[PDB]
Task: structure prediction
Amino acid sequence: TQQPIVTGTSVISMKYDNGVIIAADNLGSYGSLLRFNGVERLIPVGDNTVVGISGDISDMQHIERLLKDLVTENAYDNPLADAEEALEPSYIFEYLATVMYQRRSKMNPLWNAIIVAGVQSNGDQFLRYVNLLGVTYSSPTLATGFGAHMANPLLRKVVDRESDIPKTTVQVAEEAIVNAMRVLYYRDARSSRNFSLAIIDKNTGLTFKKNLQVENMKWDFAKDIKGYGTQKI
Amino acid sequence: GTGYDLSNSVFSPDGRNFQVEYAVKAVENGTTSIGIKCNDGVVFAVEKLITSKLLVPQKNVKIQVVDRHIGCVYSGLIPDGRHLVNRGREEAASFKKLYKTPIPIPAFADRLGQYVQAHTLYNSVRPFGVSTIFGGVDKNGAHLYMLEPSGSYWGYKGAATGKGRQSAKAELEKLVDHHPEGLSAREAVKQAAKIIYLAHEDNKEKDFELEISWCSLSETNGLHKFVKGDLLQEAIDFAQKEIN
Result:
């Protein structure tokens, strides 16, 4: 892929005391046209991993097929695919990251920014990032696109360091994620009011909420805005 | 003349490929494996000879899964069976990639059959040494197939191959006669355990371990799963009662 066509906007994710939360809008933009709605960009893999993909939707579907094939291959000749020998988030990440760096090095990348979020077997929270360049970085807060600019400050106000992760509750993290989604809908032209949100808790498990909407929007002050300076009516 | 049994793909004056028949003998030297088609799926069973108590029980799996809905169990040269299962997994992956839809059971059967028939076509390749009973549930329901080293494969109501293949075939004929309406998934599992236990008596010199898998539209939602735990022990007890 040399130029993205149908594109997916921002993805956001953070860590909390018992796991991770990731979220992404359900919009497939054909450039400036908001062409497709209800496009799920969060792909669950097992009961401990969610992959949030932003970018070329065709390459996103390719990565979906690749993840499904990886699950199928890990099921082969593995009587422990249900337990110790199940796909860990780190495995899925490292595989995707190797694929992305290879595609970059062949001068034909997957025009995507991927955030892998999950809980390992030992309960540790895994949150990491990869992109079309193969760059990998991990932080208590991770976001793509406009997310990385706007949601990251709000989410970092909750968890600036690793020491803030044990103190952050699931409710606080989910509220911060919803506020970041609302802010993106405010100031992102390629955002959608409809989004999806996954919560991977080492105790509760995988909670996947679809068809969510941005609520409690402030638009009343728009009635008082008149002209662009000197106009009054 | 003589020497028609020294090179693969060589037709004898009868019209036979003796190397294929020798591979069939190698299969007949293997353990007993069976497949039973029920009303909403298939059940596979196999006997694992416990050569020594040093073998880890419940490990050393013999039934292999293909895609997420196909089960395969082979009697004969286990390594050749693994080679064939790997080739079948590649075929299923290719099919799903190209046509999105999971590979149908007849398509998978024909893929394996063409692979084996190609392996019976050249003197540079040895015929396969495994008879494979496989199948599963697709959009057209349940399917149970058996494939011989000659490349010949057929769809079966019940199939069996190995040393105790004859007693298993007789018991399967009894089951087909006494159940025209069709067996249920758990009933098929119990009958497979029974038939495996009955066919072990031919080589009762060493103890054996039973291994059962099933793919049922209602009991496993169409996915190939190993019967373990309470159901496996229940089938074992049913067989132990059936023998005496």
